[PDB]
Write an enzyme that holds these catalytic residues in place. Structure first.
Site, short mmCIF file in Angstrom:
data_model
loop_
_atom_site.label_atom_id
_atom_site.label_comp_id
_atom_site.label_asym_id
_atom_site.label_seq_id
_atom_site.Cartn_x
_atom_site.Cartn_y
_atom_site.Cartn_z
N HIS A 1 32.54 99.05 -35.74
CA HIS A 1 33.59 100.00 -35.40
C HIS A 1 34.64 100.00 -36.51
O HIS A 1 34.85 98.98 -37.18
CB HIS A 1 34.31 99.64 -34.10
N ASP B 1 36.87 97.08 -36.12
CA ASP B 1 36.32 95.76 -36.44
C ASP B 1 36.61 95.39 -37.89
O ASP B 1 36.80 94.22 -38.21
CB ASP B 1 34.81 95.71 -36.23
N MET C 1 24.51 101.91 -39.60
CA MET C 1 25.15 102.63 -38.52
C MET C 1 26.62 102.24 -38.47
O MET C 1 26.99 101.11 -38.80
CB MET C 1 24.47 102.32 -37.17
N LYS D 1 26.30 104.86 -20.86
CA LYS D 1 26.57 103.71 -20.01
C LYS D 1 27.03 104.26 -18.67
O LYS D 1 27.81 105.23 -18.66
CB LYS D 1 27.66 102.81 -20.62
N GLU E 1 20.83 101.65 -24.69
CA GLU E 1 21.00 100.20 -24.67
C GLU E 1 20.25 99.63 -23.47
O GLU E 1 20.37 100.16 -22.36
CB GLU E 1 22.48 99.80 -24.61
N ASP F 1 19.93 99.98 -29.04
CA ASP F 1 20.69 98.75 -28.84
C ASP F 1 19.85 97.80 -27.99
O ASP F 1 19.54 98.11 -26.83
CB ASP F 1 22.02 99.00 -28.14
N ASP G 1 28.19 94.53 -17.29
CA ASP G 1 27.42 94.59 -18.54
C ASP G 1 27.40 93.21 -19.19
O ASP G 1 28.41 92.77 -19.75
CB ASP G 1 28.04 95.65 -19.44
MG LIG Z 1 25.77 99.17 -27.10
MG LIG Z 2 26.34 96.59 -22.99
#
Ligand SMILES: [Mg+2]
Ligand SMILES: [Mg+2]
Ligand SMILES: [Mg+2]
Ligand SMILES: [Mg+2]
Ligand SMILES: [Mg+2]
Ligand SMILES: [Mg+2]
Ligand SMILES: [Mg+2]
Ligand SMILES: [Mg+2]
Lengths: 386, 386, 386, 386
Positions: free
Chosen positions: D53, D56, D87, D182, D216, D244, D254
């Site tokens: 990110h 980050d 990525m 998600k 993911e 992912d 999660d």
């Molecule tokens: Mg992910």
């Molecule tokens: Mg996750």
């Protein structure tokens, strides 16, 4: 208009309205609240009292002189407002030392520290007038199978609670313990994950009469369980010492929504049961105002908890008082459920040819239970359509 | 090659391999199996014995003369094969008369009939040599909140089990009871929904030593719970009388897959625990061969249950015997978890300044638990990569 | 008093009130209903029409002469009552030949049979005036990973729907298709498990304008998803051709409770959305009267579906009309959500220093969203406390 | 021995091994990692590259001079190690300004800020050589029904992605977008909650060829969905741009466990599919080393991700190469699933009396699918028992 008064026994944790909004993916959205200002604002809303973790009231690492000053300020706010402190608990989950648990940490020295931290707060709870001391073992558990031998962990858990019971009885304290179950989060699986597991564990303690449960709406619903059913089993066992009220939308992370949010019909049946059974303990809200909210939204959310309880209380009472509902309860044979199956005893049952040899199984099978009409009457009452 | 023998104590219900494939949305895909041919085929596969509901063995409504003939044929097949019957149970769920339950039906006459139907099969179970009598209350529950007062229902449930305990003790029978929990299906919510709830309920019975649990892999996983953890609590309480092995893919309808399917790593930790704890009861499979299968697929599925248990047994034993794993268990302080927190007693703990006043909380917090290395060693052993 | 009329467009499947109560663990508790008597009773309750699978109306295996007689009787009951038939569908799940699916069965000859069985009922649906033809692929899926190559299965699914679209366009029929998703049950996992998966698949068909979705309340909730959100995405894509209304208590077997049961607040937000968006299709109930009920309970349950929709419709309309709610919607900036982010275009956004260089990120972060006050106003309206 | 090399294309987010262990209930247990030291350590383990990110790599609020210094240090570590950056993504969830979302925040000025923050990082991603730009809308959603009009929110979401597509095409950038779904957490419900919803949304964008999905493992399993099935539908649509990899134990918060943990058999079928389909993109791990671990446990966990992929790759390849498995695939008619249902066309199907009039439905129904033998062969291969 659905206005709470301290006689309604609504209580709130300091950590509820004081939640700053820091979640796994984001920073805090609200500044920290002074516990004194939380007590004042909750009193204005009609609350009966507040609850606390040790670390909510006294910042971790405080000296014994700063500790007395924090208690002094708090006690003055309680005297200024008339607020009570019916319950207290220990934070055995935030500090990194508790990363593998408190009472069941693999490291023995952490377990001893966890017990000493708890005992110190029990003394304070008794001084403030608390009647119930809650334990939520949020870090007792595991993410992987080999990390925790669960039989050894239960030995350590029993050892810790037995020592706490020895402490309170040797000091002559009039306080009882309530275990708060949660199935998961923050550990992958948490020990004693439901009301049932906690009730079963209590029966293996040395002094079981000192321990009960503090079930939370959302936690049983994180296992997809029926919360009113679990509360009924706790009441049946005589173990409902305390309760955490909030809302949860199904099987997911612990949302801690305001009470009445989430599963509305379960909230209705919960209130019906608590009021019918004469539960006299605090109506405690363990909720988090969403981090979308400012401080005005915090107090609106807290007021909503109490409002929704009082609306549901009114609807449940009208439901039970409705003569047509009383007729429908008899049509569904709720009256027969309350009567003994075989008060005549085993030998009379074995000799009763109407119970087997001459029982008309097809005629009994054809009887409808009339449950759907009863449930629509309950819906009509909940929605005010009747 | 991973070949079972009767010494492995693998058992199967008649209703498992005999399931005809009728599900809520479809007709049966397989013809009915004669119980005699099921006993023969299972014996050829290496099974130790079979289990039954009354209605699996004797069709409902049979006369007392047809009943003796069905038992006679069955007993001859057991003598011909050497198969045992370690467990039996009652069908209190298929007939429409049980649509609102058996022991907790609202109608009192149904409750009395349910008890008489159970007692009759207990006599038969003892005659066939069964040591455990299972109760699965599949119809005890509700779809709506007002249909069932759960405190009254638990009274009726306790009354029924107390009467069964009075019956077996007055007859001098050497048999014990095991309650099989399930959270839901076919009722919207089922009473005593998990191992924990069942364990807690047993402690309120008049003769608790006569009752234990029969947990099923898939049923605890229908509540998202950790099945090995629940089994550990049952073993800790001394209540694991029997076990149902199968597979389940998460929170959904009860799949009853063959053992080893579903959550494979939970199956590994389950076998590790059962074998380490010295569980000596039957390894019972309550599974359904999928309705996609013909009879060849039925016996392949049954053989797969036993095969997967024996493979997992081998991998778990290699895991525990590996010196590098034993080193990693000490690195993660599993040895310290087994040692008492405070064998020196409460007063010594309170005076121990190293437990609180002088405890270095930052140094203890910095200790890594090394759980991930341990878990990868367990993975390597499971996959045969070590 | 909350009385439905045919103008409300409430419809019911023949298989709903006609469900005999046979579940995976029990026999039927009710006798079969003649489709003619179901049409008459539903008309008396205020329904607009009925829907059917081919095998609900014409028993499987009927000769072409018995088939005409069954249609004749049905059409006479429709003329006698004024009931419409807005939707029809195919049973590709009950007969054992479909045990591995219809359109995606591994056996090619089963796939061809499934298509021919569907085409025959499309002709009948058009003859009865149906405007929507639903496909629920209940057997399209797998219990194990190697049984189904999902890319090949999707090829076969696309091939089948493309052929059905070629058939209806070559015949000149004015009918559209709606795919009904379900995540699991009776297969371990079902292909196209949610509204989203179905919407994505439709965009790969040769004639996408002929296909939409028929979402069911309980099915999206079996995946823990927000049903009103999924309906909004279907409406946004212009693909909500039909809808199945019922109730579901969380992640478990498909309960098919009467509408309004299960998640009550989701039912409120669903009705709010359907009415605000001007959905003009049938309000179809795919529900099962619980097997505890006799025929009086069946019709009470059906009446409850319509009653609860009309109560929720009234509460949602009062909510949206309340000036204080309209004020709260502006306080939460629902009005700003409806305005374009950058109608000035990309270059204007890039040159807008107030959007980044000079944006006051702390002042914007401090704005509360006032969502909790808005949600308590919605609660007050739902409960009739306002 | 199951040793990764950069040719295996294993990649890690900076935020994975760099996770400090701060969860909703606890403080961080690990110090922050310098991104430069993460790049070095991952290169030593055999990784191919890293992802980030914006926040980050460059702390939020950094000046344009500090920003160049952070990029300079990072680029030097990439040159020193040979690590790639395939990525990148934007943090639109941590700062309180995003508490109601980024692209779909109710406040218009926040939406414009979110777009400008994204565009700035796209420039940086292209400069570092990234080929995929991921969007995870973690704050796009709601806790209550009236807070978000989902049709308006989808308009705003489409507007934002269309503007990003206009930006990359006007700049001539060779980069594509991947939406990461998600279902919930940190919002009560998140928009585009599954792979299916994301795939459907992409088809309404102005330039759909620029957008795909980044599914993911754990996120689809938070909805109880079959992750390999969802990946197959993404591959079928030509939209699997990135993936992912991690582990999840069922429907709960999660967990982001290391890959291979959680559902082991789903990991096996996932690897089988990715390798059979020739997926050539990065094998990216979005995981969190549990907060029980120190830095040695962090790198052990990261190594475990790659190890488990390579073991599963070997087992899946042996499974597909086994002549007995190839025989079993034909016995279960996987070959027939790959053949067209009706390559002869619609008219030939309608005239084919063997497809309906003369089809032997009982003979086809009697064919067993032999799925259980096939699945036990897959189990034997996974466990190395064959
Ligand atoms: Mg992910
Ligand atoms: Mg996750
Ligand atoms: Mg909670
Ligand atoms: Mg709580
Ligand atoms: Mg089962
Ligand atoms: Mg069982
Ligand atoms: Mg359904
Ligand atoms: Mg439906």
């Amino acid at each position: 208009n659905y206005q709470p008064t301290p006689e309604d026994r609504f209580t709130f944790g300091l950590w509820t309205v004081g939640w700053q909004g820091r979640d796994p993916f984001g920073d805090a959205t609200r500044r920290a609240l002074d516990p004194v200002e939380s007590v004042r604002r909750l009193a204005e809303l009609g609350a009966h009292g507040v609850t606390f973790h040790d670390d909510d009231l006294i910042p971790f690492g405080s000296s014994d002189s700063e500790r007395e000053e924090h208690v002094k300020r708090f006690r003055q706010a309680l005297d200024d407002t008339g607020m009570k402190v019916p319950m207290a608990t220990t934070n055995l989950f935030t500090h990194p030392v508790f990363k593998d648990g408190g009472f069941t940490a693999n490291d023995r020295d952490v377990r001893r520290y966890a017990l000493r931290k708890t005992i110190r707060n029990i003394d304070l709870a008794v001084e403030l007038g608390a009647e119930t001391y809650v334990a939520w073992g949020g870090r007792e558990g595991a993410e992987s199978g080999g990390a925790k031998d669960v039989r050894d962990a239960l030995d350590r858990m029993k050892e810790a609670f037995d020592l706490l019971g020895e402490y309170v009885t040797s000091q002559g304290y009039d306080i009882r313990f309530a275990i708060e179950p949660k199935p998961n989060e923050p550990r992958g699986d948490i020990l004693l994950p439901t009301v049932g597991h906690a009730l079963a564990f209590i029966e293996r303690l040395e002094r079981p009469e000192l321990y009960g449960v503090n079930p939370e709406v959302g936690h049983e619903q994180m296992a997809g369980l029926n919360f009113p059913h679990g509360i009924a089993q706790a009441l049946w066992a005589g173990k409902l010492f305390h309760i955490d009220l909030n809302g949860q939308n199904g099987i997911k992370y612990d949302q801690d929504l305001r009470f009445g949010a989430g599963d509305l019909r379960a909230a209705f049946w919960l209130v019906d049961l608590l009021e019918s059974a004469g539960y006299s303990g605090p109506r405690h809200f363990d909720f988090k105002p969403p981090r979308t909210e400012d401080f005005d939204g915090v107090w609106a959310s807290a007021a909503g908890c109490m409002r929704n309880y009082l609306i549901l209380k009114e609807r449940a009472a009208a439901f039970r008082a409705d003569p047509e509902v009383q007729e429908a309860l008899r049509a569904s044979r709720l009256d027969e459920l309350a009567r003994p199956t075989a008060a005549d005893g085993l030998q009379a049952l074995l000799d009763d040819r109407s119970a087997f040899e001459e029982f008309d199984v097809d005629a009994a099978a054809a009887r409808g239970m009339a449950f759907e009409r009863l449930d629509q009457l309950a819906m009509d009452h909940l929605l005010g359509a009747r």
